[PDB]
Structure formats: structure tokens, C-alpha cells
Amino acid sequence: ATQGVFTLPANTQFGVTAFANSAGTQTVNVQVNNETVATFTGQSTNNAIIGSKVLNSGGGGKVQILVSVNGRSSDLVSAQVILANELNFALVGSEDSTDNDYNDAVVVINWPLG
Amino acid sequence: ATQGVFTLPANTQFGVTAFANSAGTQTVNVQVNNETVATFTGQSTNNAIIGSKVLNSGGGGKVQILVSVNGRSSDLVSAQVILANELNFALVGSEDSTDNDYNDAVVVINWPLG
Amino acid sequence: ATQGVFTLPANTQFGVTAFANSAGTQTVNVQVNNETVATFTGQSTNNAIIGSKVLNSGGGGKVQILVSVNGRSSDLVSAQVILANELNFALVGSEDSTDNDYNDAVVVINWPLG
Amino acid sequence: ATQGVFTLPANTQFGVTAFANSAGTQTVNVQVNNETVATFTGQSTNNAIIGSKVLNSGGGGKVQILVSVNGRSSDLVSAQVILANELNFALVGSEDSTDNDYNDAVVVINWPLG
Ligand SMILES: CO[C@@H]1O[C@@H](C)[C@@H](O)[C@@H](O)[C@@H]1O
Ligand SMILES: CO[C@@H]1O[C@@H](C)[C@@H](O)[C@@H](O)[C@@H]1O
Ligand SMILES: CO[C@@H]1O[C@@H](C)[C@@H](O)[C@@H](O)[C@@H]1O
Ligand SMILES: CO[C@@H]1O[C@@H](C)[C@@H](O)[C@@H](O)[C@@H]1O
Ligand SMILES: [Ca+2]
Ligand SMILES: [Ca+2]
Ligand SMILES: [Ca+2]
Ligand SMILES: [Ca+2]
Ligand SMILES: [Ca+2]
Ligand SMILES: [Ca+2]
Ligand SMILES: [Ca+2]
Ligand SMILES: [Ca+2]
């Protein structure tokens, strides 16, 4: 199945934060309604934050996360969880190799903000 | 029900990251096996990161998040989600007032690292 | 926080299924747009299905689960999870006593159908 | 990523329930520590329950769900959600055709029981 794609409510501010846990340098691409709006590039084997930004979901609400290492697309896993029918988390893990820890880049999307 | 309490595998490193979205200064206490190991204090209405640390779950694996604003306990909501039977997110939201956005402090715990 | 309340897309068919794990007879009330549309009454200490029905979320999309045992409201826990940005689960546990297993009535809501 | 594989606590009773939403007849295979312990076969386009059993997780706690239609493996999506650090749901969807609704067989695993 496709992973890393989420439908947010329209015109909503959201946070996106990425962490790295790999020998490989991670590139996280964030798209909103099919346009790249953020890029995080970094490397850590100890969960360093490689980016955190506030974005708007726009008219369409479509948010897509892609992860690559040296140009190779990482395999993604994702889900959305809603707490108290209002607090949302869109969650991504990614795997750049074959150990299947799925933490090589970890991406957390959160809304609402403010 | 009690919220903000999670059982991690023993002696395992985990990331804890807190975000703020409130007029109130947030205090996030992180306890491992019933002892405070970290406290994050900060203020933001724009999802600023008020703390991010790597911690160890210790022998018992018990991790508890408590949130307060000027000595008043916030109401917590939480859940744990596991992707691909391997990547874990323990998620906390909190409410310090009456609008019920539950984002006033948001805490994300992730494991494994590395 | 309020638990057991979920916002579904309007005019959408959904499944609701309840399981019992308690000495006490469970009465699960399902409200759609603030009107009772199903009542499941049963008893089991071994996960018997006490109801499974197809319902419609109607104009407003509001679904609420309440559980009582001998007329006393059980404490609820809940969350929603979405897989592949499409497959939805709204999940409820309930506690009728002091052992905090939260499984005394378990309620699973799933959509879409068909 | 591999989907439909879950680690339960050892030697633990759990519920497994399968629902169908497809023109295709669903065959759901349940394995405990790499051996089949149940098979559910049925058809519905209205969320009928095609199986519900109580099973034991065995010494290793490994539970796997596989779904096929007329011998063809369905694509799976899955996650586990834990409420109140106690109440567990392991969730599977599956897709047998081209519409990507992932509901064609839906499997819910719940524990603890009792
Ligand atoms: C080469 O493998 C990459 O780096 C290692 C240090 C591990 O983090 C592994 O999960 C990652 O996929
Ligand atoms: C006074 O209320 C607090 O501050 C506001 C600016 C909002 O973030 C609200 O959610 C928060 O509870
Ligand atoms: C009296 O307590 C009720 O029945 C027992 C058999 C247990 O299922 C317990 O969780 C439940 O709350
Ligand atoms: C042929 O397609 C199968 O049957 C249809 C009635 C739908 O349920 C579709 O999701 C399913 O994959
Ligand atoms: Ca890896
Ligand atoms: Ca890694
Ligand atoms: Ca608030
Ligand atoms: Ca707020
Ligand atoms: Ca109980
Ligand atoms: Ca019980
Ligand atoms: Ca389908
Ligand atoms: Ca279908």
C-alpha cells in the first residue's frame, strides 16, 4: 500500500518534525498539495532532530512525506492517530537498508497548533 | 483512566520530544521507573520544541509523562502506536484551559533508536 | 477528556462490534447524532460478541459509545487510527470495576464498508 | 514492509475476529509462532463476521495474519494500538483488487481477555 500520504483538514497549520537513526544521510521531502514545501537533510545514529517546521495544509489538505538516502527511496510505514477526537498525529517511519528497524528517518506531523 | 504512562522494553534507549502550543508556560516531567529523569520547561504558541533528549527506560521500562502550568496539572490524553511490529510511538497531549485543543504541551516518545 | 466520541464522514455506513470480558452484564449504547440507534446487552468473561451491526453516520457524522453495568457508567478509553489514509478504526475500552483492564466491554467501529 | 505480524505477550489468550467487505471470498490464515491455528473462510459486502475465536499466543507470542482470495495473496496494512497502557488492538486490512479500500478482509486481534 501507499504510505506517508495523509489528508489533513483544509487550511490548517501543522508541525512536521524529523529525527534520524542511521549511518546514511537522510533527505526528508514534505509536499503539500503536490508541491515541495520543506526539506530536511541530516545524519544521526542517536535520534537527532534534522528538522522542525510549521506549514499550512492549504486548500487540498494533502500532505506527503518521502525519504531518500543518496537518491534511493526508503521504504515507508505510516498511520494517523486521533486522540480525544481532536488531537492528530500523522506518523512515518522509514527503512534505508534491510535491518527493518524503520527508524532511519522518523517523521511526526502534529495538528492543531496554537 | 490514567494517561501518559507507557511500558517500554527494558534497558532501551528512547527519544522524548516536547512541543508547546499555549499562552501558558509548560512544565513536562519525564519519570523513568518512578523517578524524574528530565523536566522540560518552555512557552510557545507555534509548536516550538521545548525539549528533546535521549533517555534509557531502565530495568522496569516504565515511562510517565506529567504536564503542568504554574503548578496546575493539565488533563492528559495518550496512546501508543506500533508500526511494522517494530517502530513505536508513545503520544501525549494535554489541556491547560478550556478550549480542548489538547495541544498545549504535546509529547512524542519514540523507539528504537540507532 | 471526553472519550468514546468520534467524527465520521457524513452519510457513511460503518460497522460496530462489541465484546464482553466481565462478570457484569454490559449495556453498550450507540448514539448517532445524539440519538440511540443500537443497544447491545450481553455478558461473557471470554470475549463473546455481544453485538455487531451496520449503522450509518447520518447528516452530522457523530458517533458516541456509552457503556453501563447495573446502571453505573463505565469509565472509557478511546482512540481512532487510520491506515493507508483510508481504513478507519475507532476503538473503545471500558472499565466497570477497579482492576483497570478496560476490556469489560470492548467496542470496535470500522469504516468504510463494502 | 512486512505487515500483519504482531508480538503478543507469551502464553496469552487473545481474541481474533475477521470481517468481510468484498465480492471475493476471503481466506484468513492465523498463525501462532509460525504454525496455522485457525482459518476463516467467508464472503460479505456488508461487514459480516467470517470468524471469531479465542486463541493462545504460545511461548513465542508471535501472531501472523495472511489473507488470500482464490489463492492470490492480498496486500496487507496493519498497526497495533495500546490504550491506557493496557488494552491492545492489533489491526489488519487487506486489498484483493484495484480500488484500494483495504477493507476486503479486516482482522481485529484484542487482548487481554477476561
Ligand atoms: C546501514 O544501516 C543503517 O545504519 C545503521 C547504523 C542502522 O541505523 C540501520 O538501521 C540503518 O538502516
Ligand atoms: C489560554 O489558553 C491557552 O493558550 C491559548 C493561546 C491556546 O493555545 C489555548 O489552547 C491554551 O489552552
Ligand atoms: C468484577 O470485575 C469484573 O469482572 C471480572 C471477571 C473481571 O473481568 C473484571 O475486569 C471486571 O471488571
Ligand atoms: C472486486 O472488488 C472487490 O469487491 C468489491 C465489491 C469491493 O468490495 C472491492 O473493494 C473489492 O476489492
Ligand atoms: Ca534501518
Ligand atoms: Ca536505524
Ligand atoms: Ca488548550
Ligand atoms: Ca493550545
Ligand atoms: Ca475491569
Ligand atoms: Ca475484564
Ligand atoms: Ca478492495
Ligand atoms: Ca472492499
Query: Domain limits of chain A?
Result: 1-114
d(CA A95, CA A26): 10
Residues 6+ apart with CB under 8 A from B78: A83, B3, B4, B5, B6, B65, B90, B91, B92, B93
CA distance to partner chain D, nearest, from residue C57 (Å): 15
CB B1 within 8 A of CB C100: yes
Which residues lie at CB < 5 A from ion ligand 7? B 95, 97, 99, 101, 104
How far from the centroid of its chain's Cα atoms is residue B16's Cα?
6
How many A×B Cβ pairs under 8 Å? 109
Interface residues of chain C, partner chain B, Cβ below 8 Å: 1, 3, 75-77, 79, 81, 95, 100, 102
For this PDB entry, the determination method is X-ray
CA distance to partner chain A, nearest, from residue B12 (Å): 13
Q: What residue in C sits closest to A90 (Cα-Cα)?
A: C82
Domain A1-114, what fold? Jelly Rolls (2.60.120)
d(CA C76, CA C95): 7
d(CA B22, CA B25): 7
**Cell numbers 535521549 correspond to what residue?**
B54
d(CA D100, CA C87): 9
Give A113 Cα–ligand 7 centroid separation in angstroms: 10
Which residue minimizes the CA distance to atom 1 of ligand 3? C23
Chains in contact with chain A (at least 3 beta-carbon pairs closer than 8 A): B, C, D
Query: What Å resolution does this PDB entry report?
Result: 1.5
User: At residue A36, what is the residue type?
Assistant: T
Which residue minimizes the CA distance to atom 3 of ligand 1? A22
Length of chain B: 114
Tell me whether residues C100 and B1 touch, CB distance under 8 A: yes
Residue-wise burial string across A55-94, b where 16 or more C-beta atoms lie within 10 A, e elsewhere: bebbeebbbbbbbbbeeeebbbbbbbbbbbbbbbbbbbbb
The SS3 of residue B71 is coil
Residues 6+ apart with CB under 8 A from B107: B4, B16, B17, B18, B19, B28, B65, B67, B91, B92, B94
Chains in contact with chain B (at least 3 beta-carbon pairs closer than 8 A): A, C, D
Contacts of B2 in chain C (CB under 8 A): 100
Contacts of A82 in chain C (CB under 8 A): 79-82
From A46, A54, A81, residue closest to B47, measured CB to CB: A54
CA distance to partner chain C, nearest, from residue B103 (Å): 13
CB C91 within 8 A of CB C19: no
Residues 6+ apart with CB under 8 A from A20: A26, A42, A43, A44, A45, A47, A48, A50, A104, A105, A106
d(CA C98, CA C95): 8
DSSP D15-62: EEEEEEEEEEEEEEEEEETTEEEEEEEEEEEEEEEEEEEEEE-TTT-E
CA distance to partner chain D, nearest, from residue B90 (Å): 9
Give B25 Cα–ligand 8 centroid separation in angstroms: 11
d(CA D40, CA D4): 15
Which residue minimizes the CA distance to atom 8 of ligand 3? C22
Tell me whether residues B102 and C75 touch, CB distance under 8 A: no
d(CA B41, CA B60): 26
d(CA A24, CA A13): 30
Tell me whether residues B81 and D80 touch, CB distance under 8 A: yes
Contacts of A81 in chain C (CB under 8 A): 79-82
d(CA C102, CA B99): 28
All cell numbers assigned to B40: 522540560
Q: Which of D85, C103, A92 is nearest to B92 (CA)?
A: D85
Tell me whether residues C79 and A83 touch, CB distance under 8 A: yes
Sign of CA dihedral C27, C75, A79, D58: negative
